[PDB]
Amino acid sequence: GHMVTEIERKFLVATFPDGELHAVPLRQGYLTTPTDSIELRLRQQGTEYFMTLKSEQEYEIQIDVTQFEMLWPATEGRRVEKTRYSGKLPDGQLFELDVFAGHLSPLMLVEVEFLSEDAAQAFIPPPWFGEEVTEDKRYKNKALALSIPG
Amino acid sequence: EIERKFLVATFPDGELHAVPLRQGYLTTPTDSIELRLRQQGTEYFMTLKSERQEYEIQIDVTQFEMLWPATEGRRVEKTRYSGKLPDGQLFELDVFAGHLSPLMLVEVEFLSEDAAQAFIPPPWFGEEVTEDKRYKNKALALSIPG
Numbered sequence: 574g575h576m577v578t579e580i581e582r583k584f585l586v587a588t589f590p591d592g593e594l595h596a597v598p599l600r601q602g603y604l605t606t607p608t609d610s611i612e613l614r615l616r617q618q619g620t621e622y623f624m625t626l627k628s629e630q631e632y633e634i635q636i637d638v639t640q641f642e643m644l645w646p647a648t649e650g651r652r653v654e655k656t657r658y659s660g661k662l663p664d665g666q667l668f669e670l671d672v673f674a675g676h677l678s679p680l681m682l683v684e685v686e687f688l689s690e691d692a693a694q695a696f697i698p699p700p701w702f703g704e705e706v707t708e709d710k711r712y713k714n715k716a717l718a719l720s721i722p723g
Numbered sequence: 724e725i726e727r728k729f730l731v732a733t734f735p736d737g738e739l740h741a742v743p744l745r746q747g748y749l750t751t752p753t754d755s756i757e758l759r760l761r762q763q764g765t766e767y768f769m770t771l772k773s774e775r776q777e778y779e780i781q782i783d784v785t786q787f788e789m790l791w792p793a794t795e796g797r798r799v800e801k802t803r804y805s806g807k808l809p810d811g812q813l814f815e816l817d818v819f820a821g822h823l824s825p826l827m828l829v830e831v832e833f834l835s836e837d838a839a840q841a842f843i844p845p846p847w848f849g850e851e852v853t854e855d856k857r858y859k860n861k862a863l864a865l866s867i868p869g
């Protein structure tokens with residue numbers, strides 16, 4: 574049957590790449606902590622703003638900038654801010670490259686999407702990619718948000 | 724803030740101003756924060772509390788009704804009537820809707836502890852529940868049908 578869940582691998586970045594990149598600044602943060610009965614997340618994607626509620630079912634409301642900045646401070650300590658660059662490798666695989674801000678600096682991650690779950694296994698990373706972290710729990714989004722400075 | 728609250732034995736006559744109210748909790752009391760939605764007549768709010776910081780944003784009706792379903796089981800819906808007793812004390816009288824029917828509560832505000840302690844309820848008031856934890860707002864919200 575057709576693709577249900579995307580197939581991807583994620584790496585550190587040894588060298589920021591050259592080439593055509595499209596930049597989007599991103600700020601996202603959790604109002605809740607993982608033991609809460611629900612997950613409530615705020616995100617800014619460019620110039621649009623959302624609050625998401627999940628219970629384990631998913632609600633998303635678009636909010637304006639003033640609603641977002643009034644509530645943002647209640648995400649302190651559980652946030653990820655980064656600029657995301659979208660690009661394409663020479664063979665055509667699309668990538669997203671995150672350059673993290675605040676205490677997660679100097680982290681940079683690159684995530685690659687594959688059309689076949691065997692092109693994924695055949696992938697040869699280009700030299701600018703660092704070590705693979707696909708399986709490392711610490712580099713998942715929520716782990717990154719919940720980590721702490723110092 | 725100086726107040727006593729009672730059941731209501733008889734709905735009163737006289738000048739009453741009615742406000743429909745709907746208010747519900749997205750969170751459960753063990754959560755790290757409390758997030759409440761409320762509709763107060765024609766304006767709508769989401770409140771976030773964490774014991775302290777408090778945040779309130781005004782939302783529109785569409786945001787409110789999109790999120791309202793995630794308050795199910797933790798809501799109070801009621802019509803609130805504002806009036807004044809013959810001696811001038813202001814009262815708020817709540818007529819509860821859904822499963823909290825047929826509950827009705829009346830709360831009175833006083834300018835002194837002495838006036839509060841001297842208060843003689845009028846005959847339309849029922850038994851006092853100022854101290855009953857069961858009749859507190861969040862307790863009412865968290866109680867369930869049946």
Ligand code: NA
Nearest residue numbers: 650651718720
């Ligand atoms: Na954090």
Ligand code: NA
Nearest residue numbers: 663664665666
């Ligand atoms: Na190709």
Ligand code: NA
Nearest residue numbers: 676677678679
């Ligand atoms: Na750092």
Ligand code: NA
Nearest residue numbers: 587700702703
């Ligand atoms: Na490399």
Ligand code: NA
Nearest residue numbers: 796797864866
């Ligand atoms: Na309830």
Ligand code: NA
Nearest residue numbers: 809810811812
């Ligand atoms: Na008087």
Ligand code: NA
Nearest residue numbers: 822823824825
């Ligand atoms: Na009932």
Ligand code: NA
Nearest residue numbers: 732846848849
């Ligand atoms: Na009575």
